[PDB]
Amino acid sequence: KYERTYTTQANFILHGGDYNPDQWLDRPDILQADLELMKLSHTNTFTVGVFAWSALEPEEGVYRFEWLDKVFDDIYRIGGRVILATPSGARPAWLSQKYPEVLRVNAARVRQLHGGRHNHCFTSSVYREKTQHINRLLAERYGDHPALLMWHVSNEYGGECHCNLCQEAFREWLKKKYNHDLDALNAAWWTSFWSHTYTDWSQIESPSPIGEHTIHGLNLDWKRFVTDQTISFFENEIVPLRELTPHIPITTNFMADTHDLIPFQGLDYSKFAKHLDVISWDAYPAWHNDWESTADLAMKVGFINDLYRSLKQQPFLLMACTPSLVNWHKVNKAKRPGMHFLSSMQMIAHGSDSILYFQWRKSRGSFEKFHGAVVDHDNRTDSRVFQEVAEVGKALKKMSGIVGTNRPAEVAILYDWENNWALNDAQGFAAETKRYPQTLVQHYRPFWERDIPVDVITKEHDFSRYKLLIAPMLYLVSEETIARLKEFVANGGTLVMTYISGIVDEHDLAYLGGWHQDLREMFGMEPIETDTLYPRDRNSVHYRGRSYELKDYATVIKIHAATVEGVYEDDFYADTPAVTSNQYGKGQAYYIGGRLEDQFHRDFYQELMEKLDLRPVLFVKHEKGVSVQARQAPECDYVFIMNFTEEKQAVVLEEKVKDLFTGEEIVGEIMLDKYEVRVVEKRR
């Protein structure tokens, strides 16, 4: 057990990031300086060619690979490695001008002009041909270069196209999904409503603000198609990569939504993950903002990490972050001294085998010229950003034992992108209080405050290995998923569900005749009414001797065999069941009918931590704001003690451990400065 599983051939933590010398070809002095600064900053891995298509192919069929040949050799000579990217992220101007079909058509059916990035038509045969060919040339030339470590396919896949080519592709997709049965499609989408019944496949179109946007089934299936065809585009990209370089691992960088650090909503990453070799993503938390504590934000980062790592049974790769500040936030505030080191260590602690940045060197002009990078316009090593990057680099060098290490969890939180889509599109409840990913984080809080390892999983992930499965607001759920949940509980698993779960099937079709028999058996109860509240509306639930504030949502509950653990205290359903528990088979099922304050989640899950013996990898006594995360090797535990507060923090090491950096045995109480991290080692 605890066997190491490696994502790449590297036996060291990758350090570096996006490199962009194709912007500096007129400046050989800068290019030479780059190599020296890479040594000084202790960076070793660099992602090259993300937006270099116009530099590789300035005219159609005219190729310039020489500058890239030199970059490969130079990086390798200083002991570095290259993550080679496919350039599909931004088409050259000559391509858009000559082949207009690569330009997107938005939902309002407006054809776009050339500009920006990440905005190609995902159906266009021309762009599929062009991207695959340039990928083939790259694979042919650099495929066996010793510096090549990894493929970085495209850049931040996202967006939709509604052109005629995509409409036809969408129609063929629908024909396959519904086995050419128009009756089945009409039944699934309930198109009898508002006389929307389709009588020919040619009538079906993608959703539009100037067309049809009132059919949930259509909206949901469209999002599914967008994901499938994006993946299709990706598969077309990697055809020569698989042929010519089967041994080189393939990834594409995932995102978080531009807001609240919730999972990217544009693409079903759970489906995407199965086509990748390793998971990678770009993190840009708004550190030092004035609407939440540093700890709250860190908790959100930990949540996303626990989601993206759990997509595979292996470490992930932080493909991008900023060493200081970004350019596109409302308030572009830079990391305070110590914060970069702290955030980097957190990334490692949650399972990253890399600390990669955007950028290496700041672009001199254009949109992201003020985005953070290792090297500022001043070209100085004197910068506090450069110095802390170097500090991270030196730390990472001493942490090669952590590479490949996993970190098993007994607690799982179930997240579903299709559920997120359906719930967001649903007409009902309250639009601004749905907050499905945020609600999951609320159930993630007590475990993060208790340093208990959590996996945030999706439905194709195995449930059997976990003692505790939490599935808040599973509004959309299939009979197959339900059956697997029933099996999970019956075999001894503990399941927690909440208000607005199992309302709808995979077609956003409402379950009829009360709630599904399985869920009713498992939970020993059933919901009969969802009460949506106004911002000033309040209620409370009395549970284990305490009344907890309720907001936004409440559920009227019909009890069968379940035990009533909590009751409402106000409104017309006062003194009726609010929290339930039910023994089912060898396991147990809990239902939380209302959205309650943080303290409820702390106390409720405290009971389960005790009942199920849920413990941290290494117990460290500390106040709130201090996070303790560990990765587990066969011979030892690597534990990160991270102070996400602006205060000194007294923590207590109950067991003797060794500082990974100094080798010093430490035990008992120690003081942590602001943003200070202690990385300790504990032999089994």
Residues that bind Zn ion (CB under 5 A): 121, 123, 161, 163, 165-166
Query: Does residue 48 sit in helix, strand or coil?
Result: strand
For position 210 contacting its own copies by CB under 8 A, the verdict is yes
State how far the Cα of 38 lies from the Cα of 375, in Å rounded to an integer: 10
For position 51 contacting its own copies by CB under 8 A, the verdict is yes
For position 211 contacting its own copies by CB under 8 A, the verdict is yes
Q: Of the ranges 10-18, 19-27, 300-308, 406-414, which one interacts with its own copies (CB under 8 A)?
A: 19-27
For position 671 contacting its own copies by CB under 8 A, the verdict is no
Nearer to its own copies, 91 or 459 (CB): 91
For position 426 contacting its own copies by CB under 8 A, the verdict is yes
Opening angle at CA 155, ends 206 and 389, nearest 5: 145
Q: What is the smallest separation between the CB atom of 375 and its own copies, expressed in angstroms?
A: 11
Q: What is the smallest separation between the CB atom of 638 and its own copies, expressed in angstroms?
A: 30
* Cβ-contact 64, 52 below 8 angstroms: no
For position 94 contacting its own copies by CB under 8 A, the verdict is yes
Nearer to its own copies, 63 or 193 (CB): 193
End-to-end CA distance of the chain: 13
State which H helix or E strand residue 46 sits in.
strand 45-48
Q: Which residues contact residue 515 at a Cβ distance below 8 angstroms, ignoring those fewer than 6 apart?
A: 502, 526, 527
Binding at 607: pick from Zn ion, its own copies, none (beta carbon under 5-8 Å per type): none
Q: What is the smallest separation between the CB atom of 267 and Zn ion, expressed in angstroms?
A: 16
Q: What is the smallest separation between the CB atom of 102 and Zn ion, expressed in angstroms?
A: 9
Nearer to its own copies, 555 or 581 (CB): 555
For position 208 contacting its own copies by CB under 8 A, the verdict is yes
Amino acid at 407: R
Binding at 538: pick from its own copies, Zn ion, none (beta carbon under 5-8 Å per type): none
Binding at 91: pick from its own copies, Zn ion, none (beta carbon under 5-8 Å per type): its own copies
State how far the Cα of 566 lies from the Cα of 576, in Å rounded to an integer: 8
Q: Considering only residues 79, 146, 337, 634, which one is a binding residue for its own copies as defined by CB under 8 A?
A: 337
Query: With b meaning 16 or more CB within 10 Å and e meaning fewer, what string describes 666-684?
Result: eeeeeebebbbbbbbbbee
Q: What is the smallest separation between the CB atom of 99 and Zn ion, expressed in angstroms?
A: 12
State how far the Cα of 585 lies from the Cα of 488, in Å rounded to an integer: 10
Binding at 327: pick from its own copies, Zn ion, none (beta carbon under 5-8 Å per type): its own copies
* Cβ-contact 472, 497 below 8 angstroms: yes
For position 357 contacting its own copies by CB under 8 A, the verdict is no
Residue 527 is encoded by which pair of tokens? 């919901």
Residue 609 is encoded by which pair of tokens? 């931590």
Q: What is the smallest separation between the CB atom of 194 and its own copies, expressed in angstroms?
A: 5
Site map (CB under 8 A) of its own copies, residues 432-471, x = contact: xx--------------------------------------
Closest CA to 478 of 501, 460, 504, 496: 504
Q: Considering only residues 77, 180, 242, 369, which one is a binding residue for its own copies as defined by CB under 8 A?
A: 369
Binding at 432: pick from its own copies, Zn ion, none (beta carbon under 5-8 Å per type): its own copies
Residue whose entry in the numeric block shows the structure tokens 């090491």: 653
For position 116 contacting its own copies by CB under 8 A, the verdict is yes
Which DSSP symbol is given to 335?
P
Binding at 131: pick from Zn ion, its own copies, none (beta carbon under 5-8 Å per type): none
Stretch 557-576 residues interacting with its own copies (CB under 8 A): 571-572
Residue 58 is encoded by which pair of tokens? 């300035």
For position 64 contacting its own copies by CB under 8 A, the verdict is no
Q: Of the ranges 89-97, 487-495, 590-598, 633-641, which one interacts with its own copies (CB under 8 A)?
A: 89-97
Q: Considering only residues 43, 44, 191, 439, which one is a binding residue for its own copies as defined by CB under 8 A?
A: 191
State how far the Cα of 258 lies from the Cα of 266, in Å rounded to an integer: 11
Closest CA to 41 of 16, 7, 70: 16
State how far the Cα of 323 lies from the Cα of 326, in Å rounded to an integer: 9
Q: Of the ranges 114-122, 132-140, 346-354, 648-656, which one interacts with its own copies (CB under 8 A)?
A: 114-122
Q: What is the smallest separation between the CB atom of 110 and its own copies, expressed in angstroms?
A: 6
State how far the Cα of 593 lies from the Cα of 579, in Å rounded to an integer: 6
Residue 325 is encoded by which pair of tokens? 């500040």
For position 383 contacting its own copies by CB under 8 A, the verdict is yes
Count residues binding its own copies (CB under 8 A): 112
For position 213 contacting its own copies by CB under 8 A, the verdict is yes
For position 3 contacting its own copies by CB under 8 A, the verdict is no
Stretch 607-646 residues interacting with its own copies (CB under 8 A): none
Q: Considering only residues 165, 334, 490, 666, which one is a binding residue for its own copies as defined by CB under 8 A?
A: 334
* Cβ-contact 436, 419 below 8 angstroms: yes
Q: Which residues contact residue 187 at a Cβ distance below 8 angstroms, ignoring those fewer than 6 apart?
A: none
Q: Considering only residues 77, 514, 544, 673, which one is a binding residue for its own copies as defined by CB under 8 A?
A: 514
State how far the Cα of 604 lies from the Cα of 602, in Å rounded to an integer: 6
* Cβ-contact 647, 672 below 8 angstroms: no
**How many other CB atoms sit within 10 Å of the CB of residue 445?**
16
Nearer to its own copies, 170 or 638 (CB): 170
Long-range contacts (CB closer than 8 Å, 24 or more residues apart) made by 644-647: 644/294, 644/295, 644/298, 644/342, 644/675, 645/293, 645/294, 645/295, 645/674, 646/294, 646/674, 646/675, 647/674
Site map (CB under 8 A) of its own copies, residues 262-301, x = contact: --------------------------xxx-----------
Amino acid at 62: V
For position 648 contacting its own copies by CB under 8 A, the verdict is no
Q: What is the smallest separation between the CB atom of 67 and Zn ion, expressed in angstroms?
A: 33
Q: Considering only residues 140, 172, 242, 431, which one is a binding residue for its own copies as defined by CB under 8 A?
A: 431
Stretch 219-238 residues interacting with its own copies (CB under 8 A): none
Nearer to Zn ion, 163 or 399 (CB): 163
> In the beta sheet, which residues pair with residue 248?
none
Binding at 572: pick from its own copies, Zn ion, none (beta carbon under 5-8 Å per type): its own copies
By DSSP bridging, strand 81-85 and strand 148-152 are parallel
Closest CA to 431 of 581, 535, 338: 535
CA atoms within 13 A on the CB side of 537: 14
For position 101 contacting its own copies by CB under 8 A, the verdict is no
Query: Does residue 126 sit in helix, strand or coil?
Result: helix
* Cβ-contact 148, 84 below 8 angstroms: yes
For position 215 contacting its own copies by CB under 8 A, the verdict is yes
Binding at 511: pick from its own copies, Zn ion, none (beta carbon under 5-8 Å per type): its own copies
Binding at 492: pick from its own copies, Zn ion, none (beta carbon under 5-8 Å per type): none
Binding at 665: pick from Zn ion, its own copies, none (beta carbon under 5-8 Å per type): none
